[PDB]
Short mmCIF file of N, CA and C in Angstrom, two decimals:
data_model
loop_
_atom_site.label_atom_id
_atom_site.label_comp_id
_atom_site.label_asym_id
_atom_site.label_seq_id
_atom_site.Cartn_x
_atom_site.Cartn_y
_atom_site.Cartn_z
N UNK A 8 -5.94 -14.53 -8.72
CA UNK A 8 -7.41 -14.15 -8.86
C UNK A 8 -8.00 -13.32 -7.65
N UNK A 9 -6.92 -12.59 -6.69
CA UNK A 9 -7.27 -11.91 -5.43
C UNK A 9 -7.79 -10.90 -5.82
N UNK A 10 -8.20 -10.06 -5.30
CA UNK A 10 -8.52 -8.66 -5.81
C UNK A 10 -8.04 -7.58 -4.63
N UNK A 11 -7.11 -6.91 -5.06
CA UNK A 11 -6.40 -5.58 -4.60
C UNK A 11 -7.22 -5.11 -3.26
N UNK A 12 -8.41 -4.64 -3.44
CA UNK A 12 -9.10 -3.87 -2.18
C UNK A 12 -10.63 -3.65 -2.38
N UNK A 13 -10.99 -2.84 -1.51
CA UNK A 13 -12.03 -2.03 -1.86
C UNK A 13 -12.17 -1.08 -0.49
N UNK A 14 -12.35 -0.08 -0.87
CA UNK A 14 -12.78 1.14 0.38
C UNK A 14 -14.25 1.59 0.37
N UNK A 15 -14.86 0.92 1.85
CA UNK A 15 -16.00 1.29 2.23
C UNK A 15 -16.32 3.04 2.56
N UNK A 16 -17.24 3.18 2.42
CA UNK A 16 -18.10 4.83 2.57
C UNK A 16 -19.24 4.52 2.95
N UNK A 17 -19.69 4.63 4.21
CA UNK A 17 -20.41 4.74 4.92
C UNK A 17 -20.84 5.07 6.29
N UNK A 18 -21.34 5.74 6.68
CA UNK A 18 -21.16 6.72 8.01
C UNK A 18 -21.92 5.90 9.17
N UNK A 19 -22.60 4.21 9.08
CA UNK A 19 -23.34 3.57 9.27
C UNK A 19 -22.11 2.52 9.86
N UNK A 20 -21.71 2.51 11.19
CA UNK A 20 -20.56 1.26 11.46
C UNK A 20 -21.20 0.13 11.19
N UNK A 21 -22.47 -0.35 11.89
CA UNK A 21 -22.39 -1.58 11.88
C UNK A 21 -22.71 -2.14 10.58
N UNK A 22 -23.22 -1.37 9.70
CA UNK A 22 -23.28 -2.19 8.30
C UNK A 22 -21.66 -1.87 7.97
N UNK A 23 -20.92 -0.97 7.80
CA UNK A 23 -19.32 -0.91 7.54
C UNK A 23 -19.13 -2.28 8.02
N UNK A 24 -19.15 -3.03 8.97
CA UNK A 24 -18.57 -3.93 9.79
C UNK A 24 -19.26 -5.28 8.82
N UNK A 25 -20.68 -5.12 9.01
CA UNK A 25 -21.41 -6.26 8.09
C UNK A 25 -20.82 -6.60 7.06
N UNK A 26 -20.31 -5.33 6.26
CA UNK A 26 -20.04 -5.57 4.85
C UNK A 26 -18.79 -6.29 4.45
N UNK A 27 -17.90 -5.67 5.76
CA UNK A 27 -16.87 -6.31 5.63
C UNK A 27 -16.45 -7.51 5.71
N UNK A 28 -17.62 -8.15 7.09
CA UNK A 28 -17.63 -9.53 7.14
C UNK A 28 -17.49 -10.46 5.59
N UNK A 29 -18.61 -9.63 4.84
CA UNK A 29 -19.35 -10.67 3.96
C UNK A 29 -18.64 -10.80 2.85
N UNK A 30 -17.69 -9.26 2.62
CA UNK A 30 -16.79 -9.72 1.77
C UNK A 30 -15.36 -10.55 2.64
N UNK A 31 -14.66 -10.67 3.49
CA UNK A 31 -14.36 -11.92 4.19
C UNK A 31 -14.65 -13.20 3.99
N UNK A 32 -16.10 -13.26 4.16
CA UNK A 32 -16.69 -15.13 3.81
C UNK A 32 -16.15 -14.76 1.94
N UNK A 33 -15.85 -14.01 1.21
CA UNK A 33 -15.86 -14.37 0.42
C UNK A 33 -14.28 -14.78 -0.51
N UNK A 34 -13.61 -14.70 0.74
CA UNK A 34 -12.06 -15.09 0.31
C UNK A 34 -11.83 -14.97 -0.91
N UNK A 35 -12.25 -13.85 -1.56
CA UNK A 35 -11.41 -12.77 -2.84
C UNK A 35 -10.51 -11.59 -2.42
N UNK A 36 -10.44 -11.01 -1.85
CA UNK A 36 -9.90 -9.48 -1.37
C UNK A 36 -8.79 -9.31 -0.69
N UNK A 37 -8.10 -9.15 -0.95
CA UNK A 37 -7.08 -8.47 -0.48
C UNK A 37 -6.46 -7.98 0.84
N UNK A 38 -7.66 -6.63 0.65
CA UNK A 38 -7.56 -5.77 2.05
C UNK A 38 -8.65 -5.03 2.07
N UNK A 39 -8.85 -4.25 3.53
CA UNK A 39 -10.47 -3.65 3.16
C UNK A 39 -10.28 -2.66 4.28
N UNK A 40 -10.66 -1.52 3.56
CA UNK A 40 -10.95 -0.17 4.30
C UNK A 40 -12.48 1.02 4.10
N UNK A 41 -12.19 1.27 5.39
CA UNK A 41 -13.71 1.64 5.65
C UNK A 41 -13.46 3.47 6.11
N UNK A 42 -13.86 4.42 5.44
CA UNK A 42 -14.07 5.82 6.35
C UNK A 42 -15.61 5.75 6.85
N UNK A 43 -15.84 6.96 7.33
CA UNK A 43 -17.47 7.23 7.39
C UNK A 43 -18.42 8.37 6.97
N UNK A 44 -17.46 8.83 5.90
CA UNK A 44 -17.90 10.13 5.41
C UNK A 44 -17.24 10.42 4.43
N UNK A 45 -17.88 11.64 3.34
CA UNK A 45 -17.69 11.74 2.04
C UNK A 45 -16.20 12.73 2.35
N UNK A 46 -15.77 13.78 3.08
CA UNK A 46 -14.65 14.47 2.74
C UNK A 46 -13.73 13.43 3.49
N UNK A 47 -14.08 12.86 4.66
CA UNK A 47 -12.58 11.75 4.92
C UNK A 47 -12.60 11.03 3.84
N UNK A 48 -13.84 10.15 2.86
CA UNK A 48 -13.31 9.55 1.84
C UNK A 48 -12.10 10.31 0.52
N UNK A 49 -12.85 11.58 0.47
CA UNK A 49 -11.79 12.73 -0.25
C UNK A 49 -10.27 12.65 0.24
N UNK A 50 -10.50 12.63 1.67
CA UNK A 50 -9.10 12.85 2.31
C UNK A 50 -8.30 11.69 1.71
N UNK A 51 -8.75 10.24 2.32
CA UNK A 51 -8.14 9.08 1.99
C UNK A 51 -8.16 8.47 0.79
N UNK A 52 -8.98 8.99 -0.25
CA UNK A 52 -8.99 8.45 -1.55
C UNK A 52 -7.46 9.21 -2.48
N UNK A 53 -7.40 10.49 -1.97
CA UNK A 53 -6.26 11.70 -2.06
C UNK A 53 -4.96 10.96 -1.77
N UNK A 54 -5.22 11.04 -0.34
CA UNK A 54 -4.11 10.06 0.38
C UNK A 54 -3.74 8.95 -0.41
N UNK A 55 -4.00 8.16 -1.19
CA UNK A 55 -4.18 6.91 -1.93
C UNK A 55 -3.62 7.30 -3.17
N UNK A 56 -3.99 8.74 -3.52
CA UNK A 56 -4.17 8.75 -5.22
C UNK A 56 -2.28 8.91 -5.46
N UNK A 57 -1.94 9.27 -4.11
CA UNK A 57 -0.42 9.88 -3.50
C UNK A 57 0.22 8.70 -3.79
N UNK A 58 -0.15 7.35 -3.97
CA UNK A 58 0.33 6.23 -3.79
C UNK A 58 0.13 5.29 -5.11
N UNK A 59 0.86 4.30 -5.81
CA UNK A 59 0.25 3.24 -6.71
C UNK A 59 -1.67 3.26 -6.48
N UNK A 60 -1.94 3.11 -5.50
CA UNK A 60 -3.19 2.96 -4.55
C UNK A 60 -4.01 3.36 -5.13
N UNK A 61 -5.07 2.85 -5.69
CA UNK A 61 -6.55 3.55 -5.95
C UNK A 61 -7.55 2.22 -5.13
N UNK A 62 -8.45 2.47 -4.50
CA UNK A 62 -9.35 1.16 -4.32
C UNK A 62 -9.56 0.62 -5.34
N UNK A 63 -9.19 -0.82 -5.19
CA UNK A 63 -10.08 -1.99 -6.75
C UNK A 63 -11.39 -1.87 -7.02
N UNK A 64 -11.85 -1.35 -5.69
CA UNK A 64 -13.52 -1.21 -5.82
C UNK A 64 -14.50 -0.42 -4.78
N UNK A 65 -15.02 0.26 -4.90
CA UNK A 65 -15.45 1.61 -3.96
C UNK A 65 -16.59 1.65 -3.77
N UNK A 66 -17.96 1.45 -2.56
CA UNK A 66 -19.03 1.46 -1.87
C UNK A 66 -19.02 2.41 -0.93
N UNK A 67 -19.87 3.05 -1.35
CA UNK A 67 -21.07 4.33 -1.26
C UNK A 67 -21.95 4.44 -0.83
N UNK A 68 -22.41 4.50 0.68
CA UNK A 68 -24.01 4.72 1.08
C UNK A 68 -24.32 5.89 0.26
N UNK A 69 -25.52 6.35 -0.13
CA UNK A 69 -26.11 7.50 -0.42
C UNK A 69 -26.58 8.22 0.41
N UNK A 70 -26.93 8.13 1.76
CA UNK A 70 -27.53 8.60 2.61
C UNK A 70 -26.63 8.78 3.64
N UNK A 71 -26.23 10.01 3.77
CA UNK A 71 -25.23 10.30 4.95
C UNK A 71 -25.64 11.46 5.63
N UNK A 72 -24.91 11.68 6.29
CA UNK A 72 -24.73 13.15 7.01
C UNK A 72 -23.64 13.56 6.71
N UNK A 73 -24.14 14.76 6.11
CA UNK A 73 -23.00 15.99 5.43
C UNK A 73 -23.53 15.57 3.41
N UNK A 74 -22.45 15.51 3.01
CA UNK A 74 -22.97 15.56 1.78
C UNK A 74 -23.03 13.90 1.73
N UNK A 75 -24.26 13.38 0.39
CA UNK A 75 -24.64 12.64 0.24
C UNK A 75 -23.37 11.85 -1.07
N UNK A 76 -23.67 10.21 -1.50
CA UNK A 76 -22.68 9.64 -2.16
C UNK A 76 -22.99 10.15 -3.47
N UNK A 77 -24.17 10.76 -3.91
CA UNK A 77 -24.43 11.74 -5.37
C UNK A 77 -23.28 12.77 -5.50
N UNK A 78 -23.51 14.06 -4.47
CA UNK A 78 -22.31 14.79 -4.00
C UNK A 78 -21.03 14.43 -3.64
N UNK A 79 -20.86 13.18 -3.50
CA UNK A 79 -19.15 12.96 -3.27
C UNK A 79 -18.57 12.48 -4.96
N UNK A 80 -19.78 11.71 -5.73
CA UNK A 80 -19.88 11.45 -7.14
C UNK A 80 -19.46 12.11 -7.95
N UNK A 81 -19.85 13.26 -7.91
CA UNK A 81 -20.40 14.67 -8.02
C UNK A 81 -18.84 14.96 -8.23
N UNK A 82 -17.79 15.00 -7.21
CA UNK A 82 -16.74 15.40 -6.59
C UNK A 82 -15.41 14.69 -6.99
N UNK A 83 -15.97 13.41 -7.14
CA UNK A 83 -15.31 12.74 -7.87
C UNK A 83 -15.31 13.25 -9.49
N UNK A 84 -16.25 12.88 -10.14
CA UNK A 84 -15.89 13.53 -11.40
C UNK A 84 -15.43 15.40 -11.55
N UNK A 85 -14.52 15.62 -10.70
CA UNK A 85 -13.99 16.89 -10.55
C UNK A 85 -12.52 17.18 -10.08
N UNK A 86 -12.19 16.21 -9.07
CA UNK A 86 -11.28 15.95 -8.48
C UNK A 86 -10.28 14.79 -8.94
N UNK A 87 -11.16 13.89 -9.32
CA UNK A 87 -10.85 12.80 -9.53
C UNK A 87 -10.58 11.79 -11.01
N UNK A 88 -10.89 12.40 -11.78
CA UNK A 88 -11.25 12.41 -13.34
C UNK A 88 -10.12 11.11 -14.19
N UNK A 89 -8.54 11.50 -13.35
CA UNK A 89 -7.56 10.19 -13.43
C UNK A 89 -8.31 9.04 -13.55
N UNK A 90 -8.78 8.69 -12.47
CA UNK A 90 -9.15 7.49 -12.21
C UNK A 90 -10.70 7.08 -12.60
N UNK A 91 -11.65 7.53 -13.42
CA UNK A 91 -12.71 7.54 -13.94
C UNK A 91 -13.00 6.18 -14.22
N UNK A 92 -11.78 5.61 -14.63
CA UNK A 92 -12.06 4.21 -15.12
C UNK A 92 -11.10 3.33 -14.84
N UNK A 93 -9.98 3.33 -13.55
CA UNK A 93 -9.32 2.86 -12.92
C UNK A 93 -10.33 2.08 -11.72
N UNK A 94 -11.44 2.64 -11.99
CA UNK A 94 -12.48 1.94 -10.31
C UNK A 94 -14.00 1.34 -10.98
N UNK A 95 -14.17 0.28 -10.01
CA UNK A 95 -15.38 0.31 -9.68
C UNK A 95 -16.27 1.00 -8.78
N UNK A 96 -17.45 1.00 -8.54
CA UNK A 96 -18.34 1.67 -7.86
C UNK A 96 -19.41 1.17 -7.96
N UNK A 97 -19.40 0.86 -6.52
CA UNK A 97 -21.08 0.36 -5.98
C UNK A 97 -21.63 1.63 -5.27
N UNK A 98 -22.89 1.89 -5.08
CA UNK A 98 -23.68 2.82 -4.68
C UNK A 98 -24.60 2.07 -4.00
N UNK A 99 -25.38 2.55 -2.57
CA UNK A 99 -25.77 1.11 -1.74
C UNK A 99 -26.95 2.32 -1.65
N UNK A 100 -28.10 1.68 -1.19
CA UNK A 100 -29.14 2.56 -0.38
C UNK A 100 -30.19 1.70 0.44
N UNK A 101 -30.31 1.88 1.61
CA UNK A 101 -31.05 1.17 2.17
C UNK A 101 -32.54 0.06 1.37
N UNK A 102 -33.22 1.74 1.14
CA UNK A 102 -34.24 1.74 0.20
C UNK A 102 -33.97 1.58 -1.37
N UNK A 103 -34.58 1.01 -1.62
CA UNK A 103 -34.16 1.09 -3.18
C UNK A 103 -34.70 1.85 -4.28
N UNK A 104 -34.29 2.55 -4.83
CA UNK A 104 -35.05 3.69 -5.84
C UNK A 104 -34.94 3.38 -7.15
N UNK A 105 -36.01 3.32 -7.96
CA UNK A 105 -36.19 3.63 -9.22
C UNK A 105 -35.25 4.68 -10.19
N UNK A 106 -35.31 6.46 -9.38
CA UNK A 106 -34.75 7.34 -10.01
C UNK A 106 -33.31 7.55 -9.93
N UNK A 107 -32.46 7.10 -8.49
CA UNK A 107 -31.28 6.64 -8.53
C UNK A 107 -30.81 5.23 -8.98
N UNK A 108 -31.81 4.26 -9.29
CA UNK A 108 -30.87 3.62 -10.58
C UNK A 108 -30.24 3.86 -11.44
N UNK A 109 -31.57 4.85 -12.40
CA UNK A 109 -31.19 5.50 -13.25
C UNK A 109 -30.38 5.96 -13.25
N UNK A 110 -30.02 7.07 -12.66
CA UNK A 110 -28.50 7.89 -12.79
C UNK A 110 -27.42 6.97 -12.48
N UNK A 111 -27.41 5.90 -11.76
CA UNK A 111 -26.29 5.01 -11.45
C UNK A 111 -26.24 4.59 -12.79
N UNK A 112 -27.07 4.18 -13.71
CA UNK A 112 -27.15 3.18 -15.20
C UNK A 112 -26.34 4.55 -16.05
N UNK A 113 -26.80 6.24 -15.97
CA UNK A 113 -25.88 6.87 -16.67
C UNK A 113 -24.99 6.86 -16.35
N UNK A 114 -24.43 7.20 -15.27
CA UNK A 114 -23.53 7.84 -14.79
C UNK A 114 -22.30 6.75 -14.60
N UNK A 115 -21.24 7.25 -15.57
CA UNK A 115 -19.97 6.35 -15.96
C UNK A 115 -18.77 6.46 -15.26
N UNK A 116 -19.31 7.01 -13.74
CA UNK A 116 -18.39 6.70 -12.61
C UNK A 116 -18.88 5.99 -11.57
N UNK A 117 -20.74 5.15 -11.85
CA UNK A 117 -21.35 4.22 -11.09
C UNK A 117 -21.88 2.82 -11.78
N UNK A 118 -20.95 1.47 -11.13
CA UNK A 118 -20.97 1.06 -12.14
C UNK A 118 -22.01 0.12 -11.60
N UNK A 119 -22.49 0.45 -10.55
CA UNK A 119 -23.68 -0.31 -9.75
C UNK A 119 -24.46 -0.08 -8.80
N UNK A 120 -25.60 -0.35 -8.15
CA UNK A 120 -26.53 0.55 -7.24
C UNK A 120 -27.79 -0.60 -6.53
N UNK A 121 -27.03 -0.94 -5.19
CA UNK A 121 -28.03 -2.13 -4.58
C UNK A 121 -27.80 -1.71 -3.26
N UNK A 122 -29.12 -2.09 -2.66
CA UNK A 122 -29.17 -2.51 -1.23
C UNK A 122 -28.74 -2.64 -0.49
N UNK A 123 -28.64 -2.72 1.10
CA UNK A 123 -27.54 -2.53 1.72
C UNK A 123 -27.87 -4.17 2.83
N UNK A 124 -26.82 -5.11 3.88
CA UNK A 124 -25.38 -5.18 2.79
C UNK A 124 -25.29 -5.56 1.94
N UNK A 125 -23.74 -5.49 1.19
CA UNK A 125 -23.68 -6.46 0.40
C UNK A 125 -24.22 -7.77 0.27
N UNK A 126 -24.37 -8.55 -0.61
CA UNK A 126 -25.04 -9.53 -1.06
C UNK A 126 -23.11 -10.65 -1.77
N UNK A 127 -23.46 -11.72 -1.72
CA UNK A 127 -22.48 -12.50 -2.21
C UNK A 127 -22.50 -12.77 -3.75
N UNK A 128 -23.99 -12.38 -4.42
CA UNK A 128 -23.81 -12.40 -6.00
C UNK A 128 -23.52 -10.68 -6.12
N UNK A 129 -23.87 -9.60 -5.65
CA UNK A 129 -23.86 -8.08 -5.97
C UNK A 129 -21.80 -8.49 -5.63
N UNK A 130 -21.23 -8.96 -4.92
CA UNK A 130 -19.82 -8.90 -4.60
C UNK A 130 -19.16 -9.46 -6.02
N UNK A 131 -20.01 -10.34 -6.53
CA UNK A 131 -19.10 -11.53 -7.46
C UNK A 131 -19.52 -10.81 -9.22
N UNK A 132 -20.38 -9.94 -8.90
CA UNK A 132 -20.12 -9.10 -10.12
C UNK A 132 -19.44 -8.12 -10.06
N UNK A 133 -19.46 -7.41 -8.96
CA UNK A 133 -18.09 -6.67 -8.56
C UNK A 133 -16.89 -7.45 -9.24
N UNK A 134 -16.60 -8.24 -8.68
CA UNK A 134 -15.36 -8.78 -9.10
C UNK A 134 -14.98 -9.24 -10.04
N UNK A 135 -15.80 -9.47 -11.04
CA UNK A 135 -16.01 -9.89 -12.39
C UNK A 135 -15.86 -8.83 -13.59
N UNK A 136 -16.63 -7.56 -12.70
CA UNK A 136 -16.18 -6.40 -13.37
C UNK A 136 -14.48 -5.74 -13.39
N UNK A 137 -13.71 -6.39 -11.95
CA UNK A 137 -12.87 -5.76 -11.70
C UNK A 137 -11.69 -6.49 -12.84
N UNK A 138 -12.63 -7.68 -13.41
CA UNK A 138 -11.32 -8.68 -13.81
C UNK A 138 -11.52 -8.44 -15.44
N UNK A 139 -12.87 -7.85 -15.80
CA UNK A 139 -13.06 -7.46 -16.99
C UNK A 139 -12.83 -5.98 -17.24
N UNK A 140 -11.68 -6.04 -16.76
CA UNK A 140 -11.26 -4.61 -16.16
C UNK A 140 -11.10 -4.31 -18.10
#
């Protein structure tokens, strides 16, 4: 009932670090990796795709420097199209928006969109999703 991984995106260490904690207290996971930006995530998601390897589950600040997690989204459904439905996807934003819900609720490479950090119920639907794979 472990779950494979998940690769953090966020250009923000100490929440990277937070998040990681919290999935830790939550003795499901595997393993856990963190970049801090949308083309190293390109790089290492690439790097990965090279491998069995896809993350079990993938978190997204929206708010970065350089291109934003819309634009790496964006990039994904371009680059990435294999794995469309090999992943989950959380989308985090400090603030919480109304109009990027929405597109997270269309958009069928986001399969979720909360607050930043993680939360221990936002993790356990993660993982629920990963198992109703």
């Amino acid at each position: 009932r472990k779950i494979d991984s998940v690769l953090l995106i966020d250009d923000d260490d100490i929440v990277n670090f937070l998040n990681t904690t919290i999935i830790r207290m939550t003795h499901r996971v595997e393993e856990i990796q963190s970049v801090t930006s949308g083309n190293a995530a390109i790089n290492k998601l690439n790097e990965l795709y090279a491998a069995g390897r896809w993350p079990s589950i993938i978190c997204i600040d929206i708010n970065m420097p350089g291109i934003n997690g819309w634009e790496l989204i964006d990039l994904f459904k371009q680059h990435f199209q294999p794995m469309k439905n090999k992943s989950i996807v959380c989308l985090l934003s400090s603030s919480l928006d109304p109009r990027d819900q929405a597109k997270a609720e269309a958009s069928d490479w986001v399969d979720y969109y909360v607050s930043k950090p993680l939360t221990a119920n936002a993790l356990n639907n993660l993982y629920n999703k990963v198992l109703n794979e």
